[PDB]
Symmetry: D2
Subunit: 291 residues, 4 copies
């Protein structure tokens, strides 16, 4: 039942790179008002890999306060370490999330076997919340086969899969093998094609600023209005071109700033600031998005 | 006017692995009768890189004889040699094909300038026929930037682009920059998602045995009937699943053999024979495709 | 003067997966006694990416306690966060390490400028200790070009380069551009070839169990005995062949366990344990290394 | 006894892009006089993949005619087709070649079983002539594992391996497994390290203009003069640095032109010219290669 359009929450930092809590609550509220189905918290987009476990627990707790039962809450609880994820998995329950998630452990080369035990351990610590297996070869460098994906997605406790892959053949194969699985599209750029291939919904960072567009694409496809599904996608794509040039996280934070949601558009070092040349475009887009 | 669902044509060899002229013709006519929009001849699917120029020119002449005027005919004329490519391009004009096409020359690491001059030299020899730029990084090993792709797609005399890539963000990007461009989807497994992302047609190998499902998806999307564009794409993928186990060129030749179109389902060595274990499955496929 | 045969220190854990302090001191001392030039501490081998900052900081303290003034001591301070890296860089200075080192930040795609800034930021925090730029493309995913390596190596503060790469052409180009640069060979299996190509020392994990052999390779080549240099290199490769099968860190921790250096040969989950079939081979290896 | 330092011959063309037999004869003679142990004809360096069988068979003739008895002779006979390869294998024997060689067929993805079969067929047609497996992952994109290489290297009729990989751990596992095997180092830039890892000689393209330097490295390691072995390799590497700038084949033919050996220094298209700006240096290189 945790199927839908969900924003991969950005984590606002202040001038000295400390977590900015007011803008977090603010971004959460903004995201709710916009009409998004839920929030995926603490993932790549939430700059998790550049924060401590306690900073991560903090953000989890705050978005929980803010988000109770208004929307669906999902905690990316993953670290390279099983114990650390298990700790975050525990907090997630404590704070009342609806599920927990974890990237396939990166950097060190682990065996599929060790990946499966890792998921199992977290699911165990999640004490009840379903798991959302997180696939993203680009960043994790972990290449999974369809067989391995069938095995992972069948572990008891696993309730959904976040496909952050542009392979839409594999997308249809996964839907083919698992008709009832909540399969989420990870690349915003190909959202419409991912849904025609079998995704139920999607989790994305650009959902923070024009979430209604993606909600729009689903409506158009459900009604067979393909040309307007194509219109919304290309409009989303002209934004993604810009964001990729400016750097996605920082660029997103910038627009959100011009929308008076995020006090400081800073990402944490080693991320660098947005190039001044890009502001004109970013303010113009912040303005326009207030459509 | 190169828009359409066009079959990437297999070339039948006899028991002594020499060209089988009777089955080629049987295969041309089979396609024509299947209502395919046209044929792309002499490509990878055609085992072109395992034949001599003469053998290649021969199939050109034979399918022109059989096809000229009934359907659209594109000639894959590319070799690693520019000189040889030109020879085949001149013959394609001579034989009366509607366009000429060529893979980015592979094996040696040429430069993009080198690649541009290469297409220029052939376009020339094609003495009037539109060039179809054929992108297939997988097999060729050439990773073209979208900027690079724009330079080629706008090179004087170029009329289309065979996108054999699964990168569908890049599909919509090309469509966005070139709204009047004939863009063929190259990976059958994602045909429907390719069209949605931008392709206006496609050239694929599995069209030889089920060209109608592919033409059906085009219809279903035009209609706004996604549920059946999906039903059909999964019907195609179940086939592709099998074909990949057995070997796509030999498995297509086998299913077509059981369909009484091709005499010997042999590919040239180094390709090997279909594993007998799959013969009963392919036998079955041929049978049910006579639907 | 940070040239030499340096061991990449393993960090021993107990039954509960907590740092095993006693075994660590024992391991620090084993290396000292085996005659190694120094220790590189808190690296990949040291499972730094699977422990906390305080743990990492703990290990640095203890090894500085144990080995200060006895051998060269380089601290891997690296993290994804520049701020976390800065924290540990300041500690390394406080405990009295000789150099500070940092992997190119991973997971997120950072620009080369962002990488330079990252090193500058850490170098600043090291307040005087030189920096050993650590190039490990396979694990990190950061493909640096030679030019990029030339820039990073010329940054004020940088005194050495840890080339954990098998490209031995780039090894001599680096040596050719930088005659005074300390250039450590990162891949133990190619040690002898790496010294022939320009490396002047090396840092390696296997140095923990048979450091005396790489010392021999350095002696051999200096003395022009390529017969023993090859003799030792194949002997080392025979063990490496094994370790790769068993899993390198765990495999090495088991060998040291049978050498009575390490109490519990465990690695932190996600790593699984050594497979029972390797026990007799490792047991037998540990016994013959007592040579 | 086909252990040695073999030059991968260049194939000279005329202004018209046809063969300059006059210069080929001169090239063969120049390498002989240089002191090369043998010649490898019709490989990538001999622009074989941009030549017809007849042109390749013609080059096989003229050099057998010009160098039989004087030096060792190895005909590269590989084509993607087993048949075209077999045809050339037969001619190699006919013209009296010492050995035969074939690159792992490329472009279409073939299985290992298919590769083994291909080699057997060629081995069969060379009717007694030993086969030199030609491994070159970079240009062919065929990735063989150590086990696969072990199987190829033990196929009956196989006499040697041309290792065109910079993986010097693999070099030594091959030497370790097969102590009697003739192992040719394929990357000129790492020749000295390739030999210290296990190779007994090399087949390289830069040998045409400075083969003596490569003989000197063999002499150097033989005598345990690693210092002059290193001096020599950096001399070779500075040439390689430039050559990679100009384009290696075109650049080789140009210095050879300034050396009077090759009349016209063209490569066949798709290769373009040496950019005008390199002429001075290449001219200068040839000037100094008269050492």
């Amino acid at each position: 039942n945790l199927r839908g359009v969900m924003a991969a929450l950005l984590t606002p930092f202040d001038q000295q790179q400390a977590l900015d809590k007011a803008s977090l609550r603010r971004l959460v509220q903004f995201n709710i008002q916009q009409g998004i189905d839920g929030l995926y918290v603490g993932g790549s987009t939430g700059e998790a890999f550049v924060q401590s476990l306690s900073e991560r627990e903090q953000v989890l707790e705050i978005v929980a306060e803010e988000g109770k039962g208004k929307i669906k809450l999902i905690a990316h609880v993953g670290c390279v370490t099983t114990a650390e994820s298990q700790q975050l998995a525990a907090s997630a329950k404590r704070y009342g999330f609806d599920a927990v998630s974890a990237v396939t452990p990166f950097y060190y080369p682990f065996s599929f076997e060790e990946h499966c035990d890792h998921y199992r351990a977290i699911i165990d610590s999640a004490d009840g919340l379903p798991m959302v297996v997180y696939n993203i070869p680009a960043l994790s460098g972990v290449k999974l086969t369809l067989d391995q994906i069938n095995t992972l997605v069948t572990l008891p406790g696993v309730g959904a899969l976040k496909q952050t892959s542009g392979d839409l053949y594999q997308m249809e194969q996964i839907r083919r093998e698992h008709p009832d699985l909540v399969l989420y599209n990870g690349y915003d750029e190909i959202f419409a094609s991912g849904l025609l291939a079998g995704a139920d919904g999607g989790i994305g960072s650009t959902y923070n600023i024009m979430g209604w567009r993606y909600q729009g694409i689903v409506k158009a496809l459900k009604e067979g209005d393909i040309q307007t599904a194509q219109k919304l996608q290309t409009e989303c794509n002209k934004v993604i071109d810009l964001l990729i040039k400016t750097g996605v996280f920082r660029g997103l934070k910038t627009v959100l700033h011009y929308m008076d949601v995020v006090s400081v558009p800073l990402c944490r070092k080693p991320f660098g600031p947005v190039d001044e040349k890009y502001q004109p475009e970013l303010k113009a887009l912040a303005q326009q998005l207030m459509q």
